[PDB]
Every structure is written in C-alpha cells, then in structure tokens.
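Record type: monomer structure entry
Structure origin: computed from sequence
Chain ID: A
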Amino acid sequence: SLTKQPEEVFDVLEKLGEYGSVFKAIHKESGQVVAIKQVPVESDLQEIIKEISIMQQCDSPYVVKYYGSYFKNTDLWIVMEYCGAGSVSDIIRLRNKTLIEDEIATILKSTLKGLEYLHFMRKIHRNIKAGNILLNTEGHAKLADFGVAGQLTDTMAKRNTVIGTPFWMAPEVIQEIGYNCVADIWSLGITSIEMAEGKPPYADIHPMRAIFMIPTNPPPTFRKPELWSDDFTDFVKKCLVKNPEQRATATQLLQHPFIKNAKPVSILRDLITEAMEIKAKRHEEQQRE
C-alpha cells in the first residue's frame, strides 16, 4: 500500500513509442490500463514538471489526465491516461487514409469541448494539431502535449523547436510573438484541413517562408472546396479569421452546424480497430528481427 515498489503497482507491457519512451501498463489493483512515460534523470526535468503541473490542474474528459509519478533507477515514471488509438495523425498515417467529414466533425466536437474547458480556466494549449489530439479505444478525443507559456522566447534550442514548425500558428502569434486562447481556434482550423487533406497548408514549404506568408496571405482554404460540404467549408472559414478579435470562440463553434450535428463516436469504431490492428501487426514484425 505504502511499501510496494512501482513494479508491484504496475504490470508494464509493450513500448508504445516516444521526451522519452512511453509504455502501456496495467494498474494491478484496479485493472485499469494506463500509459507510463519513462524519463531519464539527464532530461530537462523542470520542463517536464511544468507539463505535469499543467496536467494536474486540468480535470476534464477532454484532456489527457495525469495519475502520478514514481522513481526507478534515476528514471522518472509519469503515469497518464491511456489512449489506445494513438493520435489522429497516427491514425491517418497508419491507415494511410485521411478522415472523412463525419469523422472530423465527431473528433473536433470533443476537441472543441477540450479547448472550451481550457479557455474557461484561462489556459491556452498552444500546439493544437492532429498529432496532439489523442483517441482512446472508445473514440473519445482528448487534448495532450500542451505547449508552455513563453516557448517562443525560451533558450535557442527549445525555441527553435517551436519556430521550426510554424504551419499551425495563427497570424497574430507570429506578429506578436505570443499566444492568447483564440490562437488555438486558428490552429483547430488548420487541423481540420490537415485531417481532411493529410497536411496543413505550407507543409512542404520552407518554414521561414511559411512564417512570412501566414500573416501576409489570405486565410487558407481546402485545395478542392467542391469535395466538402458547406458546413465544413464555413466552419473552417470561421476558425481561420485572421483578425483574432473577430475569430469565433470554442463555445461559439460548438453551436456551428458542422459540429452541433456531429455523429456519435460509434462512427469511429472501425477506423480505430483498423489503426490499432495495423500498429500491433507492425509491432510483431519489428521484434521478429
């Protein structure tokens, strides 16, 4: 209860991916499957601790939860909510297939409920993108891997990590070099395009050229608007308002027709079965050698 070591509390299973390796595990006492990230002591712990604290302060079905921490041989074990389907980006990659409208609407609805919660608590995500939206085995989307306040003006190495990938940044974020809540909504719009087409606009363009273009150019649109309904088209248009003062909020977008008519998560069941089957299959093959 108070005496037993981490390996008596959790049955640690297969590595799931990647700062540090993330493993799947079962919390023995309650049977609940969890994810455990193992961070070596050499790491930037103060950055991790910042991230852990942000998680602890969140308590929402739409944000990945933190359960606690343990030490084992200099490594720090961070125990979190397990999302077995991986990220949206992973699901797209694994199945080699973009998401159809219904699928996007259903996921973005839960994503928007996450943003609304965060924005209500005066928090900003800062790195909204398909890669940071995670799905559990039930099809419930949850926000994860938040950015941190002041990340654009930290030391060079940590800062260049952010600047190096600017495709999801709102115009004002580039112009003012900071974030407000409303910046997440722009990123959501870019993410909706990403989920439908497989990449954000400017993705294949040199990052510094994208940084110049974002505040200069008109708002992005679908490459082929004819393939998409008016609700989806208009939803993206509302997200991608360049003037942050005129950009829809999370609460407002939750009443947009595209979102308000989202189908239940049951429509995601097959694509999650597929994504997970593909990930497990490649896992068998990778250890075969």
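Annotation 1: The radius of gyration is 19 Å.
Annotation 2: Strands lie at 10-17, 21-27, 33-39, 66-72, 75-81, 86-87, 133-135, 141-143.
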